[PDB]
mmCIF file of C-alpha atoms and ligand atoms in Angstrom:
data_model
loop_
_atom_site.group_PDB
_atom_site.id
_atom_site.type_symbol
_atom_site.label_atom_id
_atom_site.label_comp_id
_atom_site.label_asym_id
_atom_site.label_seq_id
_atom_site.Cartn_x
_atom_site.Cartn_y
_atom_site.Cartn_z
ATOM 1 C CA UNK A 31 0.000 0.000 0.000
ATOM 2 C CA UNK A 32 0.919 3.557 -0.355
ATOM 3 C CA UNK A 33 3.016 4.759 2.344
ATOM 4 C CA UNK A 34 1.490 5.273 5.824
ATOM 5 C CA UNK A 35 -1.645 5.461 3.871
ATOM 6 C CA UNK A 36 -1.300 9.342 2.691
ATOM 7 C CA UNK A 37 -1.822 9.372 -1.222
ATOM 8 C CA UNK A 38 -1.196 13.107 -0.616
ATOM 9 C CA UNK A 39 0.048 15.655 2.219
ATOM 10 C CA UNK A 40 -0.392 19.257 2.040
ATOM 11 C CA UNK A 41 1.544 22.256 3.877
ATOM 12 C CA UNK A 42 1.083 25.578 4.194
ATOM 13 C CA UNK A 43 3.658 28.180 4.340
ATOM 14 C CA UNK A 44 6.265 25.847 2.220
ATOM 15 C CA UNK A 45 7.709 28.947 0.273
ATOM 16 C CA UNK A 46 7.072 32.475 2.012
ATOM 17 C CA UNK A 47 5.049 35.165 -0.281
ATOM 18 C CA UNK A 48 7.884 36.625 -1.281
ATOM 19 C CA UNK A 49 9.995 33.755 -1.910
ATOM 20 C CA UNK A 50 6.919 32.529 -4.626
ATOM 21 C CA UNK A 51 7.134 36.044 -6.054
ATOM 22 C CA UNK A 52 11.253 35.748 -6.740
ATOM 23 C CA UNK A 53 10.620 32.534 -8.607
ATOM 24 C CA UNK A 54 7.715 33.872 -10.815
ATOM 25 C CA UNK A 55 9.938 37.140 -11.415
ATOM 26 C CA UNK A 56 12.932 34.932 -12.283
ATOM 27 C CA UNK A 57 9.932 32.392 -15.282
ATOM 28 C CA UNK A 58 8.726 35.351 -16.530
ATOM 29 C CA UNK A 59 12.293 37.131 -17.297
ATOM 30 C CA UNK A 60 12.702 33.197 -18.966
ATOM 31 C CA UNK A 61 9.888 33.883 -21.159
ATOM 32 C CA UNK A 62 6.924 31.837 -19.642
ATOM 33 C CA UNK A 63 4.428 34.555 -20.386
ATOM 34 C CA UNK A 80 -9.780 19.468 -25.485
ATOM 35 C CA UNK A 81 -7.849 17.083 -23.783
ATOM 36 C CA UNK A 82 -4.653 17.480 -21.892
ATOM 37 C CA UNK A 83 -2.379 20.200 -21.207
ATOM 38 C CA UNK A 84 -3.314 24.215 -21.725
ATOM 39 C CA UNK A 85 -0.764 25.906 -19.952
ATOM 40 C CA UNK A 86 2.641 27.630 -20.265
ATOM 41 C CA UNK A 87 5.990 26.426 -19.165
ATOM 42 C CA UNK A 88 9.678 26.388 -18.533
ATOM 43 C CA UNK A 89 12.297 24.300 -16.566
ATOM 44 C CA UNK A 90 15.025 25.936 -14.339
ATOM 45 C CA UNK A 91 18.749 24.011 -14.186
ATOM 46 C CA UNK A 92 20.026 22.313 -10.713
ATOM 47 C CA UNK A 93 21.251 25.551 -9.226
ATOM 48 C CA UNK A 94 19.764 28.332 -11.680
ATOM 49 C CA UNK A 95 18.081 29.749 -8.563
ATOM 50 C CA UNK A 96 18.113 29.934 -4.388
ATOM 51 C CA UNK A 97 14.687 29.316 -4.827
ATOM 52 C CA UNK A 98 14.612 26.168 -6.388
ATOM 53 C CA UNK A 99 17.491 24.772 -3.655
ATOM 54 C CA UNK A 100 15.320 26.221 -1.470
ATOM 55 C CA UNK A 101 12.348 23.607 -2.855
ATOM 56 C CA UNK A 102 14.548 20.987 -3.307
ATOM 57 C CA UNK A 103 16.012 20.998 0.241
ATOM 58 C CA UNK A 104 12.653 21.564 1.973
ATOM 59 C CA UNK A 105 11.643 18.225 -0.373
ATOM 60 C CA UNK A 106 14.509 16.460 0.554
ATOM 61 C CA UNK A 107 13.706 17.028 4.370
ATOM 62 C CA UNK A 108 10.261 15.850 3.886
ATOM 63 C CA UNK A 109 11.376 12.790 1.819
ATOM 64 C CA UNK A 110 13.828 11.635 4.678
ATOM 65 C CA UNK A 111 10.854 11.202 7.175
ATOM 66 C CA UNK A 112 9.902 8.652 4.644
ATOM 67 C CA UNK A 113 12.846 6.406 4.456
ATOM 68 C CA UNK A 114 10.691 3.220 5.218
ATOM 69 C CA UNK A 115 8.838 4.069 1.787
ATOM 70 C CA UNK A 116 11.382 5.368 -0.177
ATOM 71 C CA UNK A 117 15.270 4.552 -0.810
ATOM 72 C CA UNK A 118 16.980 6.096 -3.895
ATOM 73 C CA UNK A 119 15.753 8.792 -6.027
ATOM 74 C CA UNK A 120 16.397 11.724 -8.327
ATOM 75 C CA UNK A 121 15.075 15.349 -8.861
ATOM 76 C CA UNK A 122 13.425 16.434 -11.500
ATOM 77 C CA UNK A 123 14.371 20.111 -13.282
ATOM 78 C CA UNK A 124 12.064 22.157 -11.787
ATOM 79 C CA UNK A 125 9.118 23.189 -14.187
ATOM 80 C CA UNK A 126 6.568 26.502 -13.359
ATOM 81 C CA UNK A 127 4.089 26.405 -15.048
ATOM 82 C CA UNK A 128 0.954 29.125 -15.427
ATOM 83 C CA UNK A 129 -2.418 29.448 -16.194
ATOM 84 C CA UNK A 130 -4.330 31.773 -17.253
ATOM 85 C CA UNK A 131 -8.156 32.535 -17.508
ATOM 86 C CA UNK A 132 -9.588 29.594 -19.546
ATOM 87 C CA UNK A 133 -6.564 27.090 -19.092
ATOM 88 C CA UNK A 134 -6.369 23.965 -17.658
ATOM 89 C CA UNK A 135 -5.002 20.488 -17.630
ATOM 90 C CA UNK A 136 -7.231 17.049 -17.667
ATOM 91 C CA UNK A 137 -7.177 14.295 -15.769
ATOM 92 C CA UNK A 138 -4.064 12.565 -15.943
ATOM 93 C CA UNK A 139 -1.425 10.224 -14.034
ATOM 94 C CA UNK A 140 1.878 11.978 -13.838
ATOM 95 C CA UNK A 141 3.738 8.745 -14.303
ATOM 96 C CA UNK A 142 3.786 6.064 -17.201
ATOM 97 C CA UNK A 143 0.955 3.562 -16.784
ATOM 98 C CA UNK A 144 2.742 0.247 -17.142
ATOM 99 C CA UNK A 145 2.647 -3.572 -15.530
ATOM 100 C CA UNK A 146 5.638 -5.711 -17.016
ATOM 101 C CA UNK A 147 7.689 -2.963 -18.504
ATOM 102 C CA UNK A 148 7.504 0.336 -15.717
ATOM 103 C CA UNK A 149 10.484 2.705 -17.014
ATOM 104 C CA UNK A 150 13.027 2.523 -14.857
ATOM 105 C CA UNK A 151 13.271 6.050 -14.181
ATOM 106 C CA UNK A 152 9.817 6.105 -13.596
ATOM 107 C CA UNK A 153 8.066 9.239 -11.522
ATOM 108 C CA UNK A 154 7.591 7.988 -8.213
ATOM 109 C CA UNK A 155 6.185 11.204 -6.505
ATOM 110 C CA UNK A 156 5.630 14.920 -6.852
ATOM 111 C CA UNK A 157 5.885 17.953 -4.641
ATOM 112 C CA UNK A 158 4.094 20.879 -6.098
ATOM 113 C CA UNK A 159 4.106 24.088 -4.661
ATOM 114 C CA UNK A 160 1.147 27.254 -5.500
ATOM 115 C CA UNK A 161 2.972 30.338 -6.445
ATOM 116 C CA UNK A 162 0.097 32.075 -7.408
ATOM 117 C CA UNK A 163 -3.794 31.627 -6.956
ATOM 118 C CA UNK A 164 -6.283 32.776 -8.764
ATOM 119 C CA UNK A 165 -8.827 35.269 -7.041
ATOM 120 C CA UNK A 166 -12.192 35.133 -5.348
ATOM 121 C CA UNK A 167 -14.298 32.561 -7.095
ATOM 122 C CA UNK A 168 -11.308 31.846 -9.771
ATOM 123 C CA UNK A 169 -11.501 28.085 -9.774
ATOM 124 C CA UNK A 170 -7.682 26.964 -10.732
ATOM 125 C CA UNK A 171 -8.724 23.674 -8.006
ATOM 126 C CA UNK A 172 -6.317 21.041 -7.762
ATOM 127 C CA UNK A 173 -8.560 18.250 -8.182
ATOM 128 C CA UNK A 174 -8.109 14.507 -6.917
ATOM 129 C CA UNK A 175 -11.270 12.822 -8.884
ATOM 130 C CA UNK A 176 -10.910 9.504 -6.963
ATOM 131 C CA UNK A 177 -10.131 10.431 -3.715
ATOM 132 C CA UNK A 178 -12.908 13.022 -3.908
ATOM 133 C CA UNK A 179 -10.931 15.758 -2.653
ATOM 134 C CA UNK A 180 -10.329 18.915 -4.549
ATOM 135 C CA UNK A 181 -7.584 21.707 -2.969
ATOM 136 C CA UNK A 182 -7.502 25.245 -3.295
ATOM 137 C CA UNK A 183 -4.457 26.848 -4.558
ATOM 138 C CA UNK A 184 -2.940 29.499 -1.929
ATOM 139 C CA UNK A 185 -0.048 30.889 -2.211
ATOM 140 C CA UNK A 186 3.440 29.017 -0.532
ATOM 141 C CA UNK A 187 1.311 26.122 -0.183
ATOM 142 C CA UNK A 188 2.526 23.194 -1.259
ATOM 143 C CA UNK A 189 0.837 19.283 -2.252
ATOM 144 C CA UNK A 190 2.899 16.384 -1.994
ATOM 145 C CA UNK A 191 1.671 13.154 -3.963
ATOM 146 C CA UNK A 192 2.518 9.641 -4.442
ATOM 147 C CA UNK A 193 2.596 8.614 -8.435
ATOM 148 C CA UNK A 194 4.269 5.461 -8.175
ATOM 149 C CA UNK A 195 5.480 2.353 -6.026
ATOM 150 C CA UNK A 196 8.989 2.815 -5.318
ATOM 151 C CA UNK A 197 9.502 -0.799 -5.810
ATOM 152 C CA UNK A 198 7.318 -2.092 -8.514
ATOM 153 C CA UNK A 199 7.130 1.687 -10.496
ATOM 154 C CA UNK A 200 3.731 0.594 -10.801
ATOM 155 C CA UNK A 201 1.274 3.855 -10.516
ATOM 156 C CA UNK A 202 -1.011 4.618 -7.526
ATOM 157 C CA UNK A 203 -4.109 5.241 -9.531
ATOM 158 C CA UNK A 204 -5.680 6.727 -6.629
ATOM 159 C CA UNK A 205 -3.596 9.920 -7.608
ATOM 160 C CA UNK A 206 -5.121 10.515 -11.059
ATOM 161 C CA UNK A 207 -5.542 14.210 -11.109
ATOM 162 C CA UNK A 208 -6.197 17.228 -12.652
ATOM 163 C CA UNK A 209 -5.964 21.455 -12.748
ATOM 164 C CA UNK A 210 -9.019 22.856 -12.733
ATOM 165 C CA UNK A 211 -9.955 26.145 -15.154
ATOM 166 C CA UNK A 212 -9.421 29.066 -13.853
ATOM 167 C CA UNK A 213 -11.961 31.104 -14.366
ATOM 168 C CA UNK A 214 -10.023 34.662 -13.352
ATOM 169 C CA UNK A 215 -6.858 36.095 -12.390
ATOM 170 C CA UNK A 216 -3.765 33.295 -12.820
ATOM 171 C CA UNK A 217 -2.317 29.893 -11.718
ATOM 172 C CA UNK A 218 1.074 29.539 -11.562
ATOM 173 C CA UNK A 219 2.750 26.137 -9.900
ATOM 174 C CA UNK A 220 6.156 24.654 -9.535
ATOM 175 C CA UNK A 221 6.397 20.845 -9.876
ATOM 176 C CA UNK A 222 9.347 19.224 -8.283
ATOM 177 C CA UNK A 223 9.142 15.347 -9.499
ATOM 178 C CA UNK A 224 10.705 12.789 -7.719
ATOM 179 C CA UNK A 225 12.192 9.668 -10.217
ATOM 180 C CA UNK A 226 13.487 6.319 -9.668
ATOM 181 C CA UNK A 227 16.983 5.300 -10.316
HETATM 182 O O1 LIG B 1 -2.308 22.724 -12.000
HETATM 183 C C1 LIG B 1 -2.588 21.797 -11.190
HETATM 184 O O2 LIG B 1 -3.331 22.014 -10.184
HETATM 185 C C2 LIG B 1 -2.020 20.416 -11.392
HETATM 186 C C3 LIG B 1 -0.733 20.434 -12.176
HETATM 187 C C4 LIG B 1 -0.361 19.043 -12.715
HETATM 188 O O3 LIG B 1 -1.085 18.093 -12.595
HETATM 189 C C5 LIG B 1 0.943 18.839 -13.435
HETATM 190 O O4 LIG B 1 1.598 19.841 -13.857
HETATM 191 O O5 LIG B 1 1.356 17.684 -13.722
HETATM 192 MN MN1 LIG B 2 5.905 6.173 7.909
HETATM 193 ZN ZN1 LIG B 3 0.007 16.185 -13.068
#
């Protein structure tokens, strides 16, 4: 089973205000201004910015309460990515469904933290379809997930998920992924 039972966490205050407005600043001077994905995005290098080693230490320090579920792993790039009024990205898992042949590098989990929320009555929900539990972006919030078994790579389908439209103001996010070695 997934472990201790939490298919997702969430935690308030993960960046400060100002620390989420630093790392939009520092996408939008990189140029990021039916179906799946309608949204904008770019990466940032290991390093590009105290922000992101900010992320991925706080991520790191999270994962290492978890060292009965997880052993080895890798970091993702970090991606922001934004939203704005009519965008949105369906359902999806955000690993490789697979049985007999998981990639080996396969997404095991994902820490994404809210940058930027959309205002009163914007939509822009985090929504968690199976688990029947839809979260409201706020900003320095973060969501941690489970996408995969760390020892099969099999996914947790529980975690099938989407982003909501927003319906005014903006979204922006930055996913940390968490990979298999
Ligand atoms: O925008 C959201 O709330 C979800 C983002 C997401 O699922 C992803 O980028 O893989
Ligand atoms: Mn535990
Ligand atoms: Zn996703």
């Amino acid at each position: 089973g997934v472990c201790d039972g939490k298919y997702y966490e969430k935690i308030d205050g993960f960046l400060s205000d100002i620390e989420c407005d630093v790392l939009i600043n520092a996408a939008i001077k990189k140029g990021l201004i039916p179906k799946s994905r309608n949204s904008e995005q770019t990466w940032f290098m290991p390093g590009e910015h105290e922000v992101i080693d900010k992320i991925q230490k706080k991520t790191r320090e999270f994962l290492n309460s978890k060292k009965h579920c997880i052993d080895k792993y890798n970091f993702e790039d970090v991606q922001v990515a934004r939203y704005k009024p009519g965008q949105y990205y369906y359902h999806h898992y955000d690993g490789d469904d697979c049985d007999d042949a998981c990639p080996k590098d396969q997404r095991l989990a994902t820490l994404m933290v809210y940058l930027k929320a959309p205002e009163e009555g914007g939509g822009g929900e985090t929504d968690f379809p199976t688990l029947k539990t839809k979260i409201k972006p706020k900003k320095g919030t973060s969501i941690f997930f489970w996408v995969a078994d760390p020892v099969t790579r099999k996914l947790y389908k529980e975690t099938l998920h989407a982003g909501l439209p927003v319906k005014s103001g903006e979204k922006i996010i930055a996913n940390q992924w968490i990979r298999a070695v």
